[PDB]
């Protein structure tokens, strides 16, 4: 691999929180080169078709700087047209969120998730999905501090990675070239316990079949467990009442 | 099931090709109540950043009629913001046409597929792959008749459906009800010879693992070969060599 | 003519109801070669500044699909500056619609009327009206018949079609080609008892008379009488009440 | 009538040339509180599906200030969906400077027509009609005085006016009160020679027979030719040639 | 200069009250060949956020006509994308009409100004400024008048107008050349007691000393209170009590 | 001061640079809570209308991300509507920058910059701009040591602050509070000689003085020369070429 890593290892990862003040949570994750702001703040409001209905919500927002893999991705304002790969995206993100969440206990209010991308080489939206889990436990964990919410309803972790088929070889964790070259390439979006979220699996004009989208599944998850291992590092969790750990930061030893 | 019809059991399909006049290929795709026009016509010309790589192209346009689910679904016309689903949903149809075909052989013209929902009851953009597959073979056969071109560069039929787990049940070809009540939904776009092109499978807020995923894509896979058995009642191929069978219309026994 | 029709002589007609089964009326409709579908469906609300006006309503959409004249018509979706075109048309066929029905009986809801053009060769706002008639009274017989609505209040019926000077001929109903050739055109909107609703007449670069006005209008409203007596095969009345008749198609001798 | 005028009577009429400075012809039209600015540029370029053909073009931007019919009138700018109303309107005003111009004669040159109305009671674009042509001629007649073009190729006046039915009486000139009251309402667009350029008659949930309409077409024609009487008091033509007359205001005597 | 005026000389200023009939307020301003219509209206209500408060308001709208510097200026329209220019000068116009009026004493409703510039030769939003004070006083006197307000809750006059360094030399009113021509330039917005209500000066790549500052700001200030002259020979007032002197227009000496 | 800062007193500053890797230039800089990251990309193209002119360009891109003075700032992104606020700001950082270089010795080629706000508590575009300079300096140093151009062609530092009148108080460097509470309120941009490059003061309803301007603008230039300090730790120049110092931070004393 161009940058020296096994087939079946991720980048250096680094997990931030506290990134930033105002947000009830907020942290810096990165992926290698590729970086993501998640923020995460509490709007006292819930959208007009859940008013009334004894439940909170949670919605993503994602964006991506125009420095963007050393090129160019002028965001939607001064433009006009935008993306429907923005909203695909987002709509990943806020399932990702809701899963891992029991809305019923959050009251209604809503978690607004911010995913800003201020550095691209591949894997963004896995990047942000990790993140932005970082920042919904510590913004819940945060609302339930300051008595806004009785417990802290965080069903379990939530993290996601890429994988692919490049020169038929099953590659983890993709960088920009890695999956501009790639046969095949997917998202899977895995839960603490082992368990599946999502998995979008692509042939990019080639086609695969279900074996070798189960050695990529597979290769998949061993990397949501090791992500999330990380992410675990900054909690400290017992009988379903989680508190943060006293890490600011978390980084795999690579 | 609600319509009396068994788990691993398909709705009606039916597949009406011929279904207009201008378009090189065009049809009228049906599983159940939902209903797309699929069409196919060439342009003589190649978006910019392909002229002169000695290739062609196949993009897609997908509608749904402001009728969908028995509602109101008003197209982005005399409206203004353009949602991301049409968009995933376009870009989904594009991948799988050209997996399906050899576009080194179409030359440097361009299949505009368009697929028109013009009622909606689930499965629509799977309906939509399914039905988008014959317009694009009849069109490039329709090519091939009128020397055009030299061959019919289709490397294999393509075709979708969609499954779920509903009340901890797996079932195949979900209508809109059983997928707004599903917990875990999935789409598969599927070759002719047993390969797959893509597959999403989302959480609707529950997880699933990876055997439950196996399982609903071995449900898949069987219903993408029961609708290709269909297509292929409708040409006549050997030896790479395309021609459209007399059947004007194939439906399924059910 | 180019093919082989008179100069006072429609091209094959043909009117198809129950075309689809969800909206509450609905068919397919086609002059030539010219096809559109004209859906209507019943929205249980009113337009804000009706409200508790004790009066329903009925407002139109029009779209072209891509494949049009044999060329590229992509829809407003994935584009962003809407046409002023459709935005004609669609007021059109509302007060054509409104002409033919009293909504002071029709209640606090509103038709939503759809028409859907698949394949265009000229007059297709012309037969858009035609065919949104049909759909529209029966959708008003449908809701009758399911009790929300105590009478069925038709007026009367109502059609359109399309006329020109073309080499200082005066033809009825204008393909594609005869229309882009035309000194003069105009559209004519009149109802079964022979009155007008709309009439426009548009030099192309070409003035007119009056009298070759009144030439025209007269050679229109024979064509409107003739596809008046068509749709007038769809339905039984009597003392203002419709019932529809036994017909599922009518189409023309030709 | 509710200002005391006859019922085939036009409101007081003005038509004030050179308004500004800038633009090769403009003029300030006005039908009783209903203004219009209308100003004629030539820009030294063509659509790109003219250039090389020798030939120029006229196309027209109309707009309502926020302060019509004493009401609000918040143009496009600050808002974002353009109505289909402002195009029907420019299309209109188009397609009659095109038909009093011989374009082969202006070169390969645009007009670019404004109008702006800046008090709107009714039968604005008919004032804006009759108040382009004023800039168009004025512009042409420049633009020969300048030695850009041999001749002045205009071909006749051009004027137009609006007409109705209102409690079933035949009323010509209709301000906003009339017009929003009428049963039946049109515009008609006519040359200095007695011919037409374009008529539509719009039944507003009523009917009307072909009778009426010539009833209203001849009351209009009698409106189109005393607007060009005065249109015509601002030239001296002679064997095609046209100069400006040493009028600078031209006013009906009412 | 290029005009043959002094280099601290405006240039001729014209200001027109009773423009037009219906808007409560407005008139025809210039500054040289720059021409702007600004006409003020009421509209019987208050912004949401406002609702309740026991205050009315103020707001601004910008337009120029597609005749700009002799040029084209397409409006928003039939365009698109709307510029930032006209939001960054509506709301100059706005800071400007709301500082000059204690709207505690308006009422809850809306004084709608607008601003629309027919001729472009530089120093347009200084003279919309200067002409959108004119017709608010002039609404809010006419609001008295109709008892629809107690007073005339006017604080003092307010005017605005450009200056700039153009090849060293500090010139006052600047036109359109004079501009694109300049090292820096700037727009003041003063009132009628000597105050300042707004100032912006910009470096054109060229860095400039507040010496230099305050020489331009000082020439701004003494080109303010001429243009106040003059707006104060329209009005009659006592112990801040307004009333319009008989004058409609109002000149300058030159 | 809510914060117990002096009247004449910054927030504590500070400016990272190397931020990030892929952008040419980049940093981070704070006035407090306000926090901005200022990246520099180099395009290897102009805009069209300078081709060929033997220049460079610089252009600016500026956007709040939605958790702004702890609230809510949707993008213009999944929205529609883009703000002129942005603009205003884009067009001012723009103006900055190409006011500091030599466009000149640049070469055809642009440096765009971006600014985004990820943490806002008022004097956001004086921060934006402060950190954009850090982030084009840096951006030609690079370029220049790559041998993309021959020298470093930056004229001088340029930085950025605002001030205002707030209870008739003199105060440097606002908060979101101090600013929104202010009667008048200023953003100042200087040059590291002690020149202006940009000043814009606003009477937010209040009026003020001459003499009030100059004594803010004297405070101003005081806090511009504090930025300025820090700014320069940063650099090693000589004879008009810059080297970066070792520093990869500054920060103030505070």
């Avoid at 927002?61 to 995206?89: D, K, N």
């Avoid at 839960?191 to 074996?211: A, C, I, N, P």
Wanted: with cysteine; charged share 30%; aromatic share 6%.
């Amino acid at each position: 691999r161009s940058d020296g890593r096994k087939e079946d290892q991720l980048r250096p990862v680094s997990i931030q929180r506290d990134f930033l003040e105002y947000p009830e949570g907020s942290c810096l994750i990165s992926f290698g080169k590729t970086k993501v702001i998640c923020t995460a703040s509490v709007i006292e409001n819930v959208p007009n078709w859940l008013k009334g209905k004894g439940q909170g919500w949670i919605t993503a927002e994602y964006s991506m700087l125009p420095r963007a893999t050393q090129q160019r991705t002028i965001r939607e304002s001064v433009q006009g047209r935008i993306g429907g790969a923005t909203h695909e995206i987002q709509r990943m993100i806020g399932r990702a969120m809701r899963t891992a969440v029991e809305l019923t206990k959050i009251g209604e209010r809503t978690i607004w998730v911010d995913c800003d991308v201020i550095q691209a080489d591949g894997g963004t939206r896995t990047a942000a999905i990790t993140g932005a889990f970082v920042a919904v436990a510590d913004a819940i964990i945060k609302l339930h501090k300051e008595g806004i919410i009785e417990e802290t309803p965080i069903k379990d972790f939530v993290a996601a990675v890429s994988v692919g088929i490049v020169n038929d070889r099953i590659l983890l964790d993709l960088n920009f070239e890695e999956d501009s070259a790639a046969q095949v390439d997917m998202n899977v979006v895995g839960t603490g316990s082992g368990r599946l979220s999502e998995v979008h699996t692509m042939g990019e004009e080639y086609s695969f079949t279900k074996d070798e989208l189960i050695k990529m599944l597979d290769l998949a998850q061993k990397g949501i467990n090791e992500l999330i291992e990380l992410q675990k590092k900054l909690y400290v969790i017992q009988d379903g009442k989680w508190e943060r750990s006293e890490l600011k930061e978390v980084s795999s030893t690579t």
